Amino acid sequence: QIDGFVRTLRARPEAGGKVPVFVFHPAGGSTVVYEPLLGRLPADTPMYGFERVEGSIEERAQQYVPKLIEMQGDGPYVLVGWSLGGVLAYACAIGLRRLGKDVRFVGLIDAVRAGEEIPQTKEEIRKRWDRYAAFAEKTFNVTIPAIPYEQLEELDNEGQVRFVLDAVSQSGVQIPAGIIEHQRTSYLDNRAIDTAQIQPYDGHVTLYMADRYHDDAIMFEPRYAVRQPDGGWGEYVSDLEVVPIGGEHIQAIDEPIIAKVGEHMSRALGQIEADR
């Protein structure tokens, strides 16, 4: 059930069968989080999960898309993700369409863009790490020394993190590798979103929309405290459907809220099977 970065959540028959749902991992998690959604989809709906790969969002899609095509040929494609996973599903939809494939459904499970753009500037890096340092001070009750802004503002997100980690390790702090790697990859995967070069998509997108981001997302990036009515997708997607689901972002992937997603999604899938 594991093949490279592809997890089989429910296998498709040797030949024929219903259209698979492809799900994409959230930052800091695997596609096992889609098991509740799977329970609320029609019986025998196949489901395959795409796990983490490296690079910009575009570079990640460039590794996913050939695999998608190896598995599902010309389509139809049903692409679904929560959080980062929604952004990844979209980037794959864009890629698949350029190659002429048939993309029938893109499900964004509260993959809501920050309500203001995140500036890609040296000033914002300075401000960001000033905030992070102030939070570190209250939490671990230490006094943080002068941040070396000159070094930090010249680095990309992965460079910034590597620098801060090296400083932390230098400072004498010993942290178990699993915790570091989980924190580091979650952080960088969520930051990857900020520079996703988002393209218009000519098909149907469903955005399942919670009420708000949870506090930790806002502490990660304060601009997530604001949401636009189209979740930031309205300019790029002509055929955008929004389905309000309530709750917080972190609740959207679980029961009971996931039942509302699965019920609507089940109807979309049903229509796809009829149109076959």
Numbering used by the authors: 1451 to 1726
Provide the authors' original text about this structure.
Two laboratory-derived mutant strains resistant to TAM1 were found to harbor non-synonymous mutations, i.e., either D1607N or D1644G, both located in the TE domain of Pks13. The crystal structure of the D1607N mutant explained its more subtle effect on binding, through the loss of ion pair interaction between the carboxylate of Asp1607 on helix α6 and the guanidinium of Arg1641 (3 Å) located on the parallel helix, α7. Without this interaction, α7 shifts away from the substrate-binding groove by about 3 Å, moving Asp1644 out of hydrogen-bonding distance from the P4 OH of TAM1.
In Mtb, Pks13 performs the final assembly step of mycolic acid synthesis, i.e., the Claisen-type condensation of a C26 α-alkyl branch and C40–60 meromycolate precursors (Portevin et al., 2004). It is comprised of five domains, including two acyl carrier protein domains, a β-ketoacyl-synthase, an acyltransferase, and a C-terminal thioesterase (TE) domain, that together contain all of the activities required for the condensation of two long-chain fatty acids. The overall structure of Pks13-TE consists of a core domain and a lid domain. The Pks13-TE active-site pocket is formed at the interface between the lid and core domains.
